Amino acid sequence: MTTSERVVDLLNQAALITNDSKITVLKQVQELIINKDPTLLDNFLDEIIAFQADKSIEVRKFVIGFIEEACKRDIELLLKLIANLNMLLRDENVNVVKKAILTMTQLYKVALQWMVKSRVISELQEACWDMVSAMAGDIILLLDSDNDGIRTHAIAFVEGLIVTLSPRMADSEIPRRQEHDISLDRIPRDHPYIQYNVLWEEGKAALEQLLKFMVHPAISSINLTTALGSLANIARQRPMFMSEVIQAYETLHANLPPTLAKSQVSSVRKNLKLHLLSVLKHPASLEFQAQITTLLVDLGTPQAEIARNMPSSKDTRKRP
Template sequence: MDFSDNIPKDLSDEEMVTEYLNQCALYTNQDERIANFHKIQEILLRKSPHLLVKFLQDVLNFTTDKNASIKKALVGFIEELCRVHEVFIPRVMMPLHMLLCDESIPVQKRVIQAAIGIYRRTLSWLCKAPTCTEDMEQAWKQLSTIKLEIANMIDSDNDGIRTSSVKFLECVVLLQTYPDETENKRSNDFSLDDVPLTLKVARRRRLEEEARLVGCYNYHNVIL
């Protein structure tokens, strides 16, 4: 069922996002809310990304929504946003951290799964930037906090949380170590040798040491 049938088709994208946001906020039917949220994601991230400046905060406000499914959908939105519009990474780190601390186990698990790609994208973004701004530094600090909290979740009583946390840490190790010289590196691979020696916010030696400790399962003792 298309839950957007009650929205006029002659509205502009901006007007449609406003309508979908209102319906997400006011409606109680979960399927209807999720469908409208995905419509928002389609418009803002794929069809009319210029509207992100106006509506991003409205979308991020769903961080405090009571419905776990909406918050999982929001994590998916943040995940795609970081992949296709890196400039907004600093805007989403705080909401992402809040979602990781959510009381819902499925929401926590979804954040950890998304963090794998977000961590890789953010580190690559920092390394390719001509200069590192204050917002970028703050985003990295917040992501480092998220990384530490996920590391602490490997002792979770929930199997899904533990498994997802281990996969995330495996990603950290791969990104923060030098590549095997015997293997051919693909063009889209990222490793420690892609980190500029001039990058102060994430220095090679510190990243390498952190990866070594993760590999030795002593990550809990690392002070980021």
């Protein structure tokens, strides 16, 4: 039999399976149509995406994973799949929403790169970009979700948006796995459709929302630690924001969330110290030495540990 005949038979078998193990069969189809004969991907998209209607949380999560892989194989498929992802981002179940956020964190930067590479933007591509951008705005809003886990996942998406929409500098410290991700400095200033200036303002607004979040009296301990992490990442990857990050740490420490300001205070302090020290280690911190040092002493950081993490001015040669 042929590959497409086997795909049909597998899909027909998946239809009879009454539990989450149908995902085994759907993964076999995914392998056949994404990896073994990629020309089939187009022809069987509707059949996999039909499972977004499955009552199983795990099967809907699988469909989100499939959309991510399909779009990483062929970014043009986002034209057909962004609506399906938008529906899953709005799923009734918080775990499906979380996975949809994780996938948006991978796909936003890829769709943006595709837009930037395109000099003529079709009607379909425009509507796709409109939806990607709306969904990004929607995830920013999820910083205010009633669900603790959704808030935590939204933080990471927002971190990624801020970094994506700001420029790399000579002393940006970029994780190797992210080396090839688009950043604002790679967006031509005269692209006729993607406007550099507008993206810059969006990235600054995203950071503004994250700084406000960090400092809010109702966030949870896991939200707090995740946001501290995200802001340290931003300070190191995008040192033009280091001032704003240090100030947010300052404001947090002066105004601890009342629910964490007694038994939990040692843990909050430790975590703030560890994150602040990771910022100090970066050579752009030397411009804010007095501020950082003061805050570290205030957190009870021993002088020796401050000294040990202090960069040498020699480390500032890349952008003094």
